[PDB]
Symmetry: C2
Amino acid sequence: PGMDSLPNPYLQSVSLTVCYMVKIKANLLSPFGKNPELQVDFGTGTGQGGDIPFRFWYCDGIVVMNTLKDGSWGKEQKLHTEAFVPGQPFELQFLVLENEYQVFVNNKPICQFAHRLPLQSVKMLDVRGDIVLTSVDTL
Amino acid sequence: SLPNPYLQSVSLTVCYMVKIKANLLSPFGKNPELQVDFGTGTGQGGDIPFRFWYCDGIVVMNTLKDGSWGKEQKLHTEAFVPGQPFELQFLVLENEYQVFVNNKPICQFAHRLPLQSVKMLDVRGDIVLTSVDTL
């Protein structure tokens, strides 16, 4: 049952472009007494409370995306998806384009998020949750 | 530097990136060329779903099917400064290839043959090829 995995939470300094890809490979856990969550932050890395141009949060059939700007969270973009099957390893992709983030799970489009803060201000990628994280790749 | 021509077996998806880094040469008696093939890898003369070609301020993109090239898509660009390192990106999406040079969008190429049929990446030209990466 043993397998190699990355620290959780996982941090990585980044510089995004208009043609930039993050590929996460992970598996949801079965936490004691709660549903597993998954959270990916494209943050400014300016410390606690610093801006988060794009947070991707998933739990129990629900995706919530949002932006933290000047200590304030904005209007949520919220959808239902069946893409994250518990116990099944998944591949989660973020594509950074000039106009939006595009999100894919297992090679299928899930949702898109129009930029609310400049992609150029993202400095820190942050992956965490009730997951076993096996790889995080960026190009 | 890397072999030139450069070959790499590939398997594309609807969210797939090729990043090429290279220095454009200044050959004595010609303008340096650059060529990238997204091909089926079915032997010489096999179909080529997408060829990207650059020389002398001109890009030409086309598809080789059943031994014949289709209607080109041709355009001008100043992005390849001769003598300078460049970075060339192909983004494979469900509907098209997207081309970027030095983090700037250049042109797009709607799929004519299925992206799933591409098996071999070929990169060549009057370049010093320093790296080729895919995700």
